[PDB]
Amino acid sequence: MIASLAGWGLFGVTVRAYQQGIRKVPFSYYPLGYVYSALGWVAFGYGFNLWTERNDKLLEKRVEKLKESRNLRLS
Amino acid sequence: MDLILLMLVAVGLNIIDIYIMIEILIMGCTVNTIYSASLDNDMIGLIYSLIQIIIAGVESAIGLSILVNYNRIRNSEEIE
Amino acid sequence: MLVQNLIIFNIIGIVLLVLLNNNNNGILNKKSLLTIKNELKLKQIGLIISIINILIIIENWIGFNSNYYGFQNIERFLNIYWGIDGISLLLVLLTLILGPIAILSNWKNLKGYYTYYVISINMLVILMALNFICLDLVSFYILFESTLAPLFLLIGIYGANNKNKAAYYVLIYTLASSLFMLLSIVIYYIIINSTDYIYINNIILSINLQSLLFIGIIIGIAVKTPLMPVHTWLPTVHSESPLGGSILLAGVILKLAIYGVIRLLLPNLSEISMMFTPIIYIISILTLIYSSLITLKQTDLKVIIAYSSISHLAVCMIGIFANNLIGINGSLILCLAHGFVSPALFILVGGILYDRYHNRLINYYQGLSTFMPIFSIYLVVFSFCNTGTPLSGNFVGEFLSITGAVIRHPIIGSLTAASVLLSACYQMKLTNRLTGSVFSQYLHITNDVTNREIFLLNWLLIPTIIIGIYPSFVTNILNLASSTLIYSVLI
Amino acid sequence: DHVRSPNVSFDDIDYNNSQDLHNAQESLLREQWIRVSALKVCRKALESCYKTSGPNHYEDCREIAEKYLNMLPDHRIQGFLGYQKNDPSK
Amino acid sequence: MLFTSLLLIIVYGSLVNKSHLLTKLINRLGLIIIIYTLLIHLNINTLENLSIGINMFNNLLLINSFNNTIIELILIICILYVLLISFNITGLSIIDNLNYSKRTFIVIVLFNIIGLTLLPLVNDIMILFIIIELQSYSLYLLTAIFNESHNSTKSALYYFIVGSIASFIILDATVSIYDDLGLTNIQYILMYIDKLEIFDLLCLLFGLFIKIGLAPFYSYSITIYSLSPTIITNYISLMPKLSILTLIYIIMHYINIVNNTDLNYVISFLILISMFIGSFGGLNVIRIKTLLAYSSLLNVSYMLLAILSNSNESIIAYIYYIIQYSLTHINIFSIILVISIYLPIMNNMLNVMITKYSPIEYINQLKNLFINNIFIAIALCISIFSLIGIPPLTGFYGKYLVLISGLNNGYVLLSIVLIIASSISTVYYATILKVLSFDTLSFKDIISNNLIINTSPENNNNEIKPEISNVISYVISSLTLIILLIIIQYENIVKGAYLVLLYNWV
Amino acid sequence: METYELIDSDPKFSRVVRYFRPSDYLTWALGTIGAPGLMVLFEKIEPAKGNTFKMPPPSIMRIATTIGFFGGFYYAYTSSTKRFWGYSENAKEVAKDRYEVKKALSEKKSPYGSSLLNPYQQDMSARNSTNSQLLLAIFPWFNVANHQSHGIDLRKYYEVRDGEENWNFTLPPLDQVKDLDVAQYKEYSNYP
Ligand SMILES: CCCCCCCCCCCC(=O)OC[C@H](COP(=O)(O)OCC[N+](C)(C)C)OC(=O)CCCCCCCCCCC
Ligand SMILES: CCCCCCCCCCCC(=O)OC[C@H](COP(=O)(O)OCC[N+](C)(C)C)OC(=O)CCCCCCCCCCC
Ligand SMILES: CCCCCCCCCCCC(=O)OC[C@H](COP(=O)(O)OCC[N+](C)(C)C)OC(=O)CCCCCCCCCCC
């Protein structure tokens, strides 16, 4: 699951990299900045995957009831 | 008769005259609630009317405060 | 692999180019090394990415099987199922090949901001290349409309004197119509609950609901392959867009509309396609005859080629709606052959003359075969190819498309044969004027075609004459793919 | 190698099974391409006879000319969408 | 947590000395309070438990998973707005010190968030009128928070009068409902949903339609948004629609029980008319805020089609659209608050008077932003391209999802008009992109030192001096890539909206 | 759906505090020191005026601690409440709750406590404070009354579960428990 947080972190690097252009500064300015923006989105990316996995469990159970209701309709 | 919008003839040509029409308009809502509540012997309608009178008062105070500062903003030379 | 390698590498390339150019902005003025020679290093990296994109698809062309019916190279990336069949493979090959040529055409004829131009050109090519390899209407539409954002900016930033009118035309014409294609895509998602190609190919709809969806989709197609009376955007945009934007807007963007028929109309709306085919022929035959006659009265050099583009695309639509293999194979070969001859003319007209004299009016140019002989050899050679001379790849496309038109409808489909005569009227008049009489008194003797502009011409002519002499290269890929598009019950 | 056609009909399968439906479409395409290949062979026989007979081409090439003009309308690619989506019995 | 901290901020602010640093520091105390509120809310409130719907405070307030979605959204958008007033939007003391001149700014905002978050939850006509006033009174005060400004005070006076008439219509509908049934609780009214005049609920909607600026009432909203300070317009043109459109959706959920067609025709008459004015209106405008006021009306027209249709796909269309439209709105206004540093300075003709309340006021003040700051110009381009509906941005999926809900319910006429109205509106979104970039190549090599940003002092001349503050830049970049790259996680987000229920169940 | 045993639909305020886990106190402590830190973190992120870090004045840090003192308690209060409602892990509290109630019924005292509030006032109080923690992020409201509408069946405290019989508590029939609805309307049917 680390690769999923790897992608989220790399999105965090892009935002800090895209922030430099808006501020018009060299892309090597304050290298600790890229770490903070990376870790911020891994925290978001960690929670985001928790939210989506939670959605899968809820949606599987709801669909169990929806399939039964359709069968009553399809009688 | 009022379908030709007669009430527009009855509202004066000052910002303060609009404020009064809003109060007279809301006054009709409260009187309607008191009418229903008493006939039904329902105090919940009277709770509503009490809230409407209190809320209609707060609306007046804010509107007048805006109007008052609107007035002094023009008369704001104060260079004497 | 394919799409995943095709997106990730291009995104990496786009990020790399942006990082290199924008590093020095800062608070101080910058005179760096990357600006030297007109951003030459940054233009090179853009040109390499165009060449590498071709290498990605060839890695997957080797694995392609010509005797397998069905989509190959199927993969899922971004919750979207992709894949390739016979028809889609060749159009992808054409799209990526025009990549290096579109960039090379604008090598030293922009006032600046070459890095922005190079990124946009590689971005438009990828978006159009990916449009042939998706497997649902929604994803087709997403890629069909995403090209407006760079193309609208590119034409506005880099355009000619009327670039504001041209930008306001491509953005609104191709959006106010493609939104009608969105409605029919949505209705597919409401009744069937899916927009996947295979899933919707097997469903039959009521003949009233077939007529609605067809009208919506063909509205979005009749603008991209400009059919009269909604063709007014193309001549304007061509005459004002940058030269590289004209190569893509004519080489590829028009062929996305013929591919729109192959995916969105013939398989799933087969019953209602039979009904509209008589009407489609009427619109296309009138497009063929009117566009040819209108070209006879034009004055801008780059408009004249623009209308010649409309006449050929009308023939392509005539062939593809013929319900036989002859018409369908001919229409697709013509789209490939037109995909090289059409860009070549804009190089001759808006890329070689316009980069020397900066005027597109026809009145200034005559007798060009005196002090510019190499230019007049290619103008003569490409004039014939543009008019279906038997040795070129256009004749194979046009003859089959005309043959397929007569097979489908002997009476009115025969009027497609007027394409052979009319195409020689406006075109040969333009060439005969340019390379005839004494050299013009308004121009001044200058260089003939440069070595770069020869390279562009030779590699748009070479593919054209291979397909003409031996078109079975295209056919061996198409045959099993194009045979799944035919609707007929014989008893 | 030489792949064998999956001889399968639209009338014996369930279209819900999109794997079998694919074979019914692929099998109906392959048989048609055989008829064109059969047709191109028959036309070759006609060409030898006419070249070889000369004046007698009307006689020595009588049934080949008759058969070729009979197979021509139906020995062509027609696709599968016609028969998949239509029911001749009804 | 919101209410308790508000009292502490009210008392504390009235004690300490009037200064900008303390005013800006108190604005950073509110940014904590809103953050703390979100952590406590998300802790106790869950989608899995609020699915059934839970009555609170003697059934006055009813909360379910549909309302709960918007409360968290409202809290989030209120964090992104407070970041503007709590940090530097430009860093130039002259332009920025306006945000810190008022100490009750953050207090009034905290008043409104209590008003906004409780409105979707109302379940009694007695508390419906009270809560709608708590939200309505907070907006008038915020519109007049800059009491020195002549235009601001003139707008609050216009806002108060229109809202007062709007609130009276809302109050009169509830009274009429009480007259027929004698019941105040909304659930008790549902027992008589077939026995009451369903048009008295429509008179309730006509009051809520005024407060969201829907035609024919659109006139005042366009005037108000084009007169208030850009920091104020950034709040009052988005927040009321977040909490009122959620309420309108619920009221329409109850209304469609009896499925009265006459009710739907009148609302379709207003939706159809609003698309016309929302599209053709913005064609001939010079002020950017007037342009975004017509843009706002058109998007509200789209969001009502999802509300009017009111099916299972309408929840998904509304829930997704209301989220993406808020982020797009914040992103656009945040950029307009920043790019004012690139305005030129005179050393003449047309005598254009600019003030510190709206330094960026005209569309042609965006000229050559492709030159002065290319990275932020693309961010504005991506944001505008989302409003146009170019895929695969967030804006496309909003229109695509709205169309599904609209056509699935037979609204063919409105679906076609919205697709005509979208293309007509593309003309005036394209003008913003025309001004941003089209004159780049003529101005490429120009001698520019008269910009407002060139009056900033030089600190050291050795260290790197970024032009834009840190926090505002990170917000613009984050919301620009979320708009651009929604295709990556779109499937998860949409499947995360299937679960938001409003008494669907089974 | 993570569901557990419903200990109390409307837990009393004094009960909710007495049931804080050590981790709940940690959250209250973290919230108390988080708000002053968040002010400092912002200054490290971006100075309020000027361009260099400057510690905010001590007065702001005192008001920041108070704001985070309530917020930490509110987060602690809501987390402790989820256990009572069954939304969270409540096995540890269930035994602790059962020990108190079984002891309470044994002494013939009411589990819910004696109340100054009359029957209508008890039931009215329950309506206001039931499910009131869902909006505890907006405004506060606590169950500070000894009412009887807690959403449980007092029969379930008679059966013995694992590890409970060792308590050797004697439970009388509910009809003899002081201050219960089943033990009050003995003379008149409308007066307790
Ligand atoms: C100047 C630069 C210009 C632009 C350059 C392009 C940058 C590309 C960055 C690559 C990042 C990457 O790879 O992201 C990979 C990661 C994790 O993917 P995963 O673990 O498989 O999760 C599942 C993904 N599926 C479905 C593909 C399998 O997804 C992301 O973070 C998604 C980006 C965030 C989008 C916003 C949605 C979340 C917020 C919700 C509020 C509405
Ligand atoms: C495959 C899809 C990937 C997604 C790509 C997203 C684009 C964002 C790129 C930002 C980089 C940047 O802002 O950099 C700017 C770069 C390069 O500018 P330059 O000439 O070097 O600098 C100029 C100034 N100088 C020379 C003085 C230093 O130009 C671009 O932006 C070009 C590509 C984007 C244009 C169209 C955007 C439309 C978005 C909607 C599409 C559906
Ligand atoms: C568990 C992971 C937590 C990560 C940290 C989160 C808090 C950030 C504070 C870090 C310290 C700091 O602010 O350091 C300071 C830096 C640099 O500032 P600069 O622009 O160079 O200013 C000039 C600095 N001088 C004075 C030295 C010249 O700021 C940053 O880089 C801010 C990064 C943006 C915040 C990322 C949050 C992402 C949110 C995602 C959820 C939606």
Residue numbers in the entry:
A (entry chain d): 1 to 75
B (entry chain K): 1 to 80
C (entry chain M): 1 to 491
D (entry chain p): 3 to 92
E (entry chain N): 1 to 347, 365 to 523
F (entry chain O): 1 to 192
Sentences from the paper on this structure:
Mitochondrial NADH [reduced form of NAD+ (nicotinamide adenine dinucleotide)]:ubiquinone oxidoreductase [complex I (CI)] is a large multisubunit enzyme located in the inner mitochondrial membrane where, together with the other electron transport chain complexes, it maintains the proton-motive force and the NADH/NAD+ redox balance that are required for adenosine 5′-triphosphate generation and a host of metabolic processes (1–3). The process catalyzed by CI comprises a redox reaction coupled to proton translocation across the inner mitochondrial membrane. In the hydrophilic domain, two electrons are passed from NADH to ubiquinone [typically ubiquinone-10 (Q10)] via a flavin mononucleotide (FMN) and an extended chain of iron-sulfur (FeS) clusters, forming ubiquinol, which is reoxidized to sustain the electron transport chain and reduce O2 to H2O. Here, we report the structure of isolated CI from the yeast Pichia pastoris (Pp-CI) and identify distinct closed and open states that resemble those of mammalian CI.
During analysis, it quickly became apparent that the sample was compositionally heterogeneous, with some particles lacking the FMN-containing flavoprotein subcomplex (NDUFV1 and NDUFV2, responsible for NADH oxidation) and some particles exhibiting an unexpected density that formed a bridge between the two major arms of the L-shaped enzyme. Our further analyses thus focus on states 1 and 3 (which both contain the flavoprotein subcomplex, with and without the bridge subunit, respectively) that refined to final resolutions of 2.8 and 3.3 Å, respectively. Therefore, we now refer to state 3 as the open state of Pp-CI. In the open state of Pp-CI, the Q10 site loops in the NDUFS2, NDUFS7, and ND1 subunits are ordered and in their closed-like conformations, and as a result, the Q10 site stays closed to the matrix even in the globally open state. The open state of Pp-CI observed here is an intermediate-level open state, with two elements in the membrane domain (TMH3ND6 in its π-bulge conformation and Tyr156ND1 flipped out of the E-channel) and the region of disorder observed in THM1–2ND3 (that facilitates NEM labeling) in open-type conformations but retaining the intact Tyr141ND1 trigonal junction (with Cys52ND3 and His107NDUFS2) and closed-like loops conformations around the Q10-binding site. Last, as also observed in twisted D. melanogaster and the Open1 state observed recently in mammalian CI, the Q10-binding site of open-state Pp-CI remains sealed to the matrix. Direct correlation of structural data with functional data showed that only the open state of isolated Pp-CI is sensitive to NEM treatment, consistent with a disordered section in the TMH1–2ND3 loop that carries C52ND3. In this way, the behavior of the Pp-CI closed and open states matches that of the biochemically defined “active” (closed) and “deactive” (open) resting states of mammalian CI.
